[PDB]
Swiss-Prot record, chain A:
This is Translocon-associated protein subunit delta. It is linked to Congenital disorder of glycosylation 1Y: A form of congenital disorder of glycosylation, a multisystem disorder caused by a defect in glycoprotein biosynthesis and characterized by under-glycosylated serum glycoproteins. Congenital disorders of glycosylation result in a wide variety of clinical features, such as defects in the nervous system development, psychomotor retardation, dysmorphic features, hypotonia, coagulation disorders, and immunodeficiency. The chain crosses the membrane at residues 29-49. Belongs to the TRAP-delta family. TRAP proteins are part of a complex whose function is to bind calcium to the ER membrane and thereby regulate the retention of ER resident proteins. It comes from Homo sapiens (Human). Residues 50-57 are cytoplasmic. Heterotetramer of TRAP-alpha, TRAP-beta, TRAP-delta and TRAP-gamma. It is found in: Endoplasmic reticulum membrane.
From Swiss-Prot, chain B:
The lineage of its organism: Eukaryota, Metazoa, Chordata, Craniata, Vertebrata. Pathway: Protein modification; protein glycosylation. Belongs to the KRTCAP2 family. Subunit of STT3A-containing oligosaccharyl transferase (OST-A) complex that catalyzes the initial transfer of a defined glycan (Glc(3)Man(9)GlcNAc(2) in eukaryotes) from the lipid carrier dolichol-pyrophosphate to an asparagine residue within an Asn-X-Ser/Thr consensus motif in nascent polypeptide chains, the first step in protein N-glycosylation. N-glycosylation occurs cotranslationally and the complex associates with the Sec61 complex at the channel-forming translocon complex that mediates protein translocation across the endoplasmic reticulum (ER). It comes from Homo sapiens. The gene is KRTCAP2. This is Dolichyl-diphosphooligosaccharide--protein glycosyltransferase subunit KCP2. Signal peptide: none annotated.
From Swiss-Prot, chain C:
It is found in: Endoplasmic reticulum membrane. TRAP proteins are part of a complex whose function is to bind calcium to the ER membrane and thereby regulate the retention of ER resident proteins. It comes from Homo sapiens (Human). Heterotetramer of TRAP-alpha, TRAP-beta, TRAP-delta and TRAP-gamma. The gene is SSR3. This is Translocon-associated protein subunit gamma. The keyword Cell membrane does not apply. Residues 1-21, 71-129 are lumenal.
From Swiss-Prot, chain D:
The lineage of its organism: Eukaryota, Metazoa, Chordata, Craniata, Vertebrata. Heterotetramer of TRAP-alpha, TRAP-beta, TRAP-delta and TRAP-gamma. Interacts with STING1. It comes from Homo sapiens (Human). TRAP proteins are part of a complex whose function is to bind calcium to the ER membrane and thereby regulate the retention of ER resident proteins. Belongs to the TRAP-beta family. It is found in: Endoplasmic reticulum membrane. This is Translocon-associated protein subunit beta. Residues 48-57 are cytoplasmic. The chain crosses the membrane at residues 28-47. It comes from the Eukaryota.
Amino acid sequence: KAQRNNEDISIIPPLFTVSVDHRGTWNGPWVSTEVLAAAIGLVIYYLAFSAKSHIQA
Amino acid sequence: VGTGTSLALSSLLSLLLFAGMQMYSRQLASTEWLTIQGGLLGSGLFVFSLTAFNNLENLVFGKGFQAKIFPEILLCLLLALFASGLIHRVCVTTCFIFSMVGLYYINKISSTLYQAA
Amino acid sequence: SKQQSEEDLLLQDFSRNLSAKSSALFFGNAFIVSAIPIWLYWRIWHMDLIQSAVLYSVMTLVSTYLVAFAYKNVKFVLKHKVAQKREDAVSKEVTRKLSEADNRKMSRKEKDERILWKKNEVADYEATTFSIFYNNTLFLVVVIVASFFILKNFNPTVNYILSISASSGLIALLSTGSK
Amino acid sequence: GSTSAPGQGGILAQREFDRRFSPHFLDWAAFGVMTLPSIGIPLLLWYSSKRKYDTPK
C-alpha cells in the first residue's frame, strides 16, 4: 500500500534485516576497454616518438 | 630539432587531438562548458597542423619556405573548423576564436625567431 | 696489436651482418611481438588457433621479417646521433680509464681507439634497446587501433591478414624513411 | 507441471577452463604482461642508461 501511495517505505519496521556482503566479481583490473587499450597504446606511443625526436636531434 | 622529425611530431599531435575530439563528441556537446573545452582543443589542432604543413613545405621545396595567408594558413584553419562543426555548431564561434588568438602570438613568435636571426 | 684493437669492434658494428648478440635479440624479439596479436584474436575475438595454425604462423613469420627489417634500419639511424650525445659522458669514463694506464708513449691512434671502443658500445646498446621498444610500440599500437576501429566492419580473418600485413609493412617503410 | 529441461551438457576439467576463458575480461591486462618484455623491459633498461650518461653540464 505504501509504495502504491508513494509514502515513506521506511515507516514500516521490517521484521528483521540481513546484510549480504559482495566483494566484487572478478573481471580483472579495469583496463579492459577497447577504447582505453588504444588510449594507453597511443599515450605510450606519443612519449616514445617524442623520445625518438629527442635522440635524432 | 630535425625538420624531418619535427614534421612527424606535429602531425602526430594534430592527429591525436582530432581522434579524441570525435570519440568524445557526444559528451563535449552536452554542456556549454564542455563545448568551450572543445574550443581549446580545436585551436591546438590548428596550431599543430600549421606547424606540420610548414615543415612539409620546407622538406619538399627546400628549407626556409615561407607560409602565406593563402592557401597554407587558410587551409589549416578550415580543417580545424570542420572538426568543430561535427561535435556541435556552437564551437565554430569559440573554436575559431581560440585559433585566432593563438595565431597572432605564433606570428609574433615566428618574427622574433626568424626575422631577428 | 694497435691496428687490430681499433678494428675489431668497429668492423662488427658497421658490417651488414648482424652481430650474434644483435641478431638473436632482434629476431627473437620480433618473433615474440608478431605472435602477441595471436593471443588477442584467440582470446577476445575467440578465433581457434589449431585449425588456422597454417595461416597464423605464415603471417607471424612474415611480420618477423619486416619488424627485424625495421630494427636494423631504425637502430642505425638512432646510433648516428646517440653516439655523439653519449660521447660526452663516455669520453670521461674512457679518459679516466686511460689515466690509470699512464702510458708514457701512448699512440694517438690508441687514444682514439679506447674512447671509440666504449662510445661504440653505448651507441650500439642504447640504440638497440630503445629501437626495439619504439618499433614494438608502433606495431602493437597500430594493430590495436586499426583492428578495433578501422577494421571494425570486417571478418576477423580478413582483419588479421590486413592488420598484420599492413602494420608490419608500413613500419618497415617508415624505417627507411627515417634514414 | 514440469519445468523446462536444459538437457545434456559437458563438464570439463580445470586446465581446459583456463585455456578457453581465464582472462576473459582480464584480456587487456594480460596483454600488458605479455608485452612487458617487448616494451616495459627495454624502456626501463634504457632509462637507467640515459640517466647515467645524461648528466647536466
